[PDB]
C-alpha cells in the first residue's frame, strides 16, 4: 500500500553526482592509462557488471586504486562514468567505437545495446 | 546532444538497495533508541538535509556511528530509510504522525509535504 515519489531516484542520482564533483566520500580512483577518475564504489557496482564483480571480491573490495586494461580509452571511460552518474550518454560519431568497447569491458549491457543500434543504422 | 536512458536512475537505486540488504560497503550505523540501521553515508546525504549537514562536517564525516535525538521513533526512521533506498513510502494512519516528525527532523521536505496533505484530508 506504499505511495511513490516519481522524481526520487533522479534526485538521489543528481546528489550522488554533486558528491562526485565535490570529491566528497569518493573511495576509489580508477586509473585508465595516464588518467585518473575518482568515484564511489557503490555507484560503480550499481552501474557495471565488471565493478560489481571487482568490489564483491573479498580482496579487491578494499583497494583504493583500480587499474583498467591498457586497451581502455580514457575518454570512453569518462563518457561512461558521466553516464553512470547522470543517465546521460554523450554518444558521438567520433567516440562511438571507444564507448561501445568500454561498455562491453565494463559490462554495461544497455549502453552496448544502443551503441550496436546506432552503428547498424550508419552501415 | 546526449541521449538518456529513462530507467537508469531507478536501476541505480535498486542496486543501492540490494547493497544495503547484503550489508555491502555500508559505512555508518544510525542509532535510534534501542535500534540500529546500517546505511551508506552517500545515500543518506543525497536524501536528507540533516545527513547532508552531518556528513559534510569535517569531524562528523569520519564517524561510524550517528545517534539520533531520543524523541525519534525507530519505525518512523525505518520507513524513511526504506523510502530513501526505494522511492516508496509506507504511509499509514498508524504511522503518519511519527513519519512526519521524523521527516521534519531529517529535513526530507517532499515527505513532509505529503504527510501534511494526508493529515489535512482526514480533518
Amino acid at each position: 500500500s506504499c505511495i511513490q515519489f516519481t522524481r526520487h531516484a533522479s534526485d538521489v542520482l543528481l546528489n550522488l553526482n554533486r558528491l562526485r564533483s565535490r570529491d566528497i566520500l569518493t573511495d576509489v580512483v580508477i586509473v585508465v592509462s595516464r588518467e585518473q577518475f575518482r568515484a564511489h564504489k557503490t555507484v560503480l557496482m550499481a552501474c557495471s557488471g565488471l565493478f560489481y564483480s571487482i568490489f564483491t571480491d573479498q580482496l579487491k573490495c578494499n583497494l583504493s586504486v583500480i587499474n583498467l586494461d591498457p586497451e581502455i580509452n580514457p575518454e570512453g571511460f569518462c563518457i561512461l562514468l558521466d553516464f553512470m552518474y547522470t543517465s546521460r550518454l554523450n554518444l558521438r560519431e567520433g567516440n562511438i567505437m571507444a564507448v561501445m568497447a568500454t561498455a562491453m569491458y565494463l559490462q554495461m549491457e544497455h549502453v552496448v545495446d544502443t551503441c550496436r543500434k546506432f552503428i547498424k543504422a550508419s552501415e | 546532444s546526449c541521449i538518456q536512458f529513462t530507467r537508469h536512475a531507478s536501476d541505480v537505486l535498486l542496486n543501492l538497495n540490494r547493497l544495503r540488504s547484503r550489508d555491502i560497503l555500508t559505512d555508518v550505523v544510525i542509532v535510534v533508541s534501542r535500534e540500529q540501521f546500517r546505511a551508506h553515508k552517500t545515500v543518506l546525504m543525497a536524501c536528507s538535509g540533516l545527513f547532508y549537514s552531518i556528513f559534510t562536517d569535517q569531524l562528523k564525516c569520519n564517524l561510524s556511528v550517528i545517534n539520533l535525538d531520543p524523541e525519534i521513533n525507530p519505525e518512523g526512521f525505518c520507513i524513511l530509510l526504506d523510502f530513501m533506498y526505494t522511492s516508496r513510502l509506507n504511509l499509514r494512519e498508524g504511522n503518519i504522525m511519527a513519519v512526519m516528525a521524523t521527516a521534519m527532523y531529517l529535513q526530507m521536505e517532499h515527505v513532509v509535504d505529503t504527510c501534511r496533505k494526508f493529515i489535512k484530508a482526514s480533518e
Binding site: 505511495i3 511513490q4 515519489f5 516519481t6 | 513510502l89
Partner: peptide, 4 residues
C-alpha cells in the same frame, strides 16, 4: 506522489 503516485500509486505505483
Amino acid at each position: 506522489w503516485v500509486i505505483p
